[PDB]
Symmetry: C3
Subunit: 157 residues, 3 copies
């Protein structure tokens, strides 16, 4: 039995002061803290993996309620989702990732990303590819307003 999975993330370059309306802290969305990192690369790959295993997404495993005081570093979330993944008897068949950013050149930091993702998934550098494209100056990634990332992963077990 094999599992196909897909994840997708977007995050703007700007920072936002937290929303307080009426004296109350109000989150902008469901898995807000889970995504605070802004690591589009590890979140997409996370929901990809989660999605194959058929477990929802970052927002169902890390609601802002449980994520309230727990550590929200994306790498750690990756790992925790891989725990639940393996928990259903699954090894990272293979994983492919596309970062979509116009500018911040990433070629330099790419093999280092694979390295880490490999460990977090307990597979090896070879079943983990990571690339980067630009939307050729178009769209919001192109106008340099944010950065995106798509991810696919195949699961074996």
């Amino acid at each position: 039995m094999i599992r196909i999975g897909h994840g997708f993330d977007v995050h703007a370059f700007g920072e936002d002061r937290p929303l307080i309306i009426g004296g109350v802290e109000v989150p902008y969305h469901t898995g807000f803290i889970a995504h605070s990192d802004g690591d589009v690369a590890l979140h997409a790959l996370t929901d990809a993996i989660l999605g194959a295993a058929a477990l929802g997404d970052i927002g169902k495993l890390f609601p802002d309620t449980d994520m309230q005081y727990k550590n929200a570093d994306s790498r750690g979330l990756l790992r925790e989702a891989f725990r639940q993944v393996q928990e259903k008897g699954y090894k990272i068949g293979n994983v492919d990732i596309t970062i979509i950013a116009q500018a911040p050149k990433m070629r330099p930091h790419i093999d280092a990303m694979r390295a880490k993702i490999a460990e977090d998934l307990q597979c090896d550098i070879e079943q983990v590819n990571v690339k980067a494209t630009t939307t050729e100056k178009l769209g919001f990634t192109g106008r340099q307003e944010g950065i995106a990332c798509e991810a696919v992963a195949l699961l074996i077990r």
Copy 2:
């Protein structure tokens, strides 16, 4: 054999109108009528299944003409597409959909989304994962001009 598939759909919230030019009625684009529903989730997922079997896509299984007076419900189309997909000796391995929408709040209904797809795909909920993410207020999905969804498929049999 096992087959991978992918489909993508974008829809505006706005209601466009029957185009009538010089007497004649001009058909906006091809799978226009079938899409009119604007259910990016079901359409994209359908596109993924057809793509998996190299069956084409929604604009080829449902030209405006053929779709003209044939009832435009996109759930039957998904069924249909899947009917054509068994006729090739293909069963649904598993399915994974990402819905990209800002304000529209999907968490409540996602499980009822999951429910339906499985009947139609005659598969079991457990092999149908569904999810929503937002583009962090960026893009056309973030300015609230519309909605999108990517879907991925693994066909077995």
Copy 3:
């Protein structure tokens, strides 16, 4: 064994004269020479192929350095890509491509496209799939500023 591979590529429609500042001729971005041939489909497919073998992406094997003089014919880069996916011992189990574009009518030339693809990818026609959608005038594609393509590819052996 099986490898999942995903690819994405965006192309603008305009051309960018070759730069000259202070005498010197300045190059634009890493893989602009490759992507110059503005063929979002063959490029998106190329990357999904490499993504799965895990050879990175075009601009990797074709740096604006090597390719300083290499030919901007996306079909060649595709065959070269399929070359390395052979060394590693890989067959094209299955491929699916989605063209996101607002107006050039693709539909009539799809089939012409799948042929060339099956050619360079040495496989059968029911092995390649090419579909085309619009984003209902939303985003940079619908504003007809550019064209984008998504590809997902399976590999065997």
